[PDB]
Symmetry: D2
Subunit: 270 residues, 4 copies
């Protein structure tokens, strides 16, 4: 069985508890931008009292072209992640793209993220589970909610019970995602923390719509939110990045909605 | 005669996307005169104590059932009589759906809001005959139409001289025998500057494929986007409802359901709007 | 009165999934009496030389256009006159669509096959009034209905006493503003033991989103599954067709298009059936 | 630019040419079953005059459970593939799951297959392209047809021009695939050989329906077909495996349809 309340030192993540923020940037553009963005997140989450985990990729492994910017790479990113972790004493979450990378990533990262497209790749899942870090499972665009249980079951079989499921939209026809809010209940009924990646659910593979979608998801009662920002969204996924100057009022509303929704008695309408 | 009304008024009631949400609530079909009175009384009392504006909803005819022999309700003449009886006895406004152009004028005598069914929303003669009555028009968004396509149906209503128009979401076809609600679609319909409603009841359907246990989660998600109102069907015993019982809310649970949505709506309508363009 | 006819007969013509394919072909709407005569003559000559059974198709009314002012065609009285004129002059059978229950009986005087529009395929009064006329019924499969759901519409037609029934594929909603044809859906409808047709013209649509250049590939794929017939709209100048011009086949290309499909059909209908269960 | 006609020694693959068969089994169950199945394919394709490439995976890398049968693995499969290749003098096609495997797989395999879920992973694509074998691109369930160009463009940027696109269905709602036959024209208009994997397009993640679907796809005019069989479909993907005793009449019909369709003058209906 998976852990219903996933603990990370001081932080407790669960669908009935105050929501936790996995927040940061899409990719490590530079040391100075990462430090600036982290400082902005930590300060805001401290004043709003939202538990916080810093998020950034060391590699964009699945871009369209071989020449697209991929980031600092494994060696430099893991080194840079430690710099952010040691200076601020903040947890780290990043994604893992090849099985061998799991253990070296686990030294620095408190939560290791399983990318959507790779969530079925057994070698990557087994290697990630072995490190014993928390595992954030990105729900694939092509998988139905009930299919999440097998990814949990494979993780449990591989000896890891610190598991989080993260919604990021479902394929809706061509070049378009929809978020089925009814899917949140199905995943919550698996008794794991459930997160919503609002940033990547806007994609039309809609920055003005991030507020609408985050509210709808968090109104269902979720363990946390996954969010990316940038001071000037115009090096990767800029159309989905939230203008960093808008972070605090955005988080403040979500904090208030969550508080209302988390205090509701669950209602059985069977 | 070009623009629709951003605020739709019905006596004391005001419907708009920035205003407190309004409930179109009742039952799927007029199963009997006595049950309709009981259901209306129950909605009216709950909405008064919770302070939620209310319009009673019930169909007089199920025009699109699976079989020729399926239960259809009282029909036009008797159904209009029951709706008027409810309206006069309770002093409550009425919404019901219209299926043929000739039904439009007699239904509008009793119904303050006349509903355009999803499958029929493009049928020009029905849309025109409905527009002519000058009643409020509730447009059900078809399972197969994208949000931006609602603009043409508004224009057709406006062309026929009616500007009291509401758009009501009820799910989109998602593969076979399944609906999904695209919450991003609400913003597109609101930018048309008409009141936009959410029919949570029919957005649960798995047509030809119930999900009654998920109604609260879905209604919370929709109303958190900030909408003009909610469309809802209930029944004292949904297993025996004469149509769409699998999606009906247990009447005994109406009050705690609405109570949560009332506070959520108040919270959301009170947020400062945020420019993220 | 329980079972539908596996072989649907119309004088000399026989329609069934194991028989040579039949063409329901013509134009989207009766744009004018003269153009309808020209188009009918062109189909009839080509089908005779290629030896393809033929039914002339044209709508007398576009009942579901975007605007109240969009071109709708001649309407009921005049359209029925033009269809009868074509029928008597050319000695050709007629298929046209029916939009309201009262239109069913007068249309059936002239039309040998009456067509049930997709959006209306569940409307009980229309289905019954159509069934009563005892004409052949062409059922358009709605963009939002799964194949197995056609069984209920057949049953409703049978309940109302008509067993001359055809199912016609025309695409399924695939996300927003897009249709896909599920070729596996053809087998499900054929196992209902009725003739199954393919409306390749409307399966190209990108509704609210043309694909005229892909019509041959799509028609070949469908007819390779082994079908009772094809539904097709053409126009001498598709850019100026009064409705659905983006999906119309250029009339000058009708003969090479049909010639390929004729040989493909003959090949496929002559294959030994194979049990892979 | 990619090669419009992809050559493999004696075999020529192109959308206007006689269709080529990539045929075999889902997974290498055992040496005896693989030898028996290959013998049956080679004999039938010889008598029907259909050019043939033998297909089998050495690993099922993306199964639901860690304990599901995965096959002989890399070392044994590459060794076993050589046994099939040397005895019969038949080309080999198999799929590659991790970047390092590309070069060792390329020694034995004439065509290396890019799995659908991984088609966007740059490290795997680059490593596969480097080996200079033919690359069969499985079109992801979540990608639209026009998106195939980037996978070609990345391959060309990586110095490989022997490219094949292979359709295998698109996500249609939950747990269901549909094959959009209009997508074949879009991929053919990219001037590469286009194949149809009918076996995996039946999936409802329908054995009696394989005949219907293969005919519809091949009626559009394709460079080839991808097909899996098993003597008793009841160790992997058995619901989609064709009963081996039915192979020859199935192929005979497709040979006849292809001949008709390939002789049609292309018709411009713009």
């Amino acid at each position: 069985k998976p852990q219903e309340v996933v603990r990370l030192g001081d932080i407790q993540m669960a669908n009935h508890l105050p929501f936790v923020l996995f927040g940061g940037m899409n990719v490590l553009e530079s040391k100075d931008l990462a430090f600036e963005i982290a400082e902005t997140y930590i300060d805001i989450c401290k004043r709003l009292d939202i538990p916080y985990v810093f998020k950034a990729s060391f590699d964009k492994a699945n871009r369209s072209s071989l020449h697209s910017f991929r980031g600092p790479g494994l060696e430099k990113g893991i080194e840079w992640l430690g710099d952010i972790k040691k200076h601020f004493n903040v947890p780290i979450i990043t994604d893992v793209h090849e099985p061998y990378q799991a253990a070296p990533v686990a030294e620095v990262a408190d939560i290791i993220q399983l990318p959507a497209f790779l969530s079925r790749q057994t070698d990557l899942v087994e290697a990630m589970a072995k490190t014993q870090a928390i595992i954030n499972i990105k729900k694939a665009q092509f998988l139905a909610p009930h299919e999440m249980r097998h990814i949990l079951h494979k993780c449990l079989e591989a000896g890891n019970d610190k598991l989080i499921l993260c919604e990021r939209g479902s394929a809706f026809g061509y070049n378009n995602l929809v978020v089925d809010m009814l899917g949140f209940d199905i995943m919550k009924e698996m008794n794991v923390p459930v997160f919503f990646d609002v940033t990547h659910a806007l994609q039309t593979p809609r920055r003005a719509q991030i507020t609408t979608l985050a509210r709808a998801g968090m109104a269902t009662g979720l363990a946390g939110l996954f969010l990316e920002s940038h001071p000037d969204p115009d090096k990767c996924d800029g159309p989905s990045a939230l203008r960093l100057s808008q972070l605090e009022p955005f988080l403040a509303q979500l904090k208030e909605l969550d508080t209302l929704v988390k205090g509701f008695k669950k209602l059985d309408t069977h």
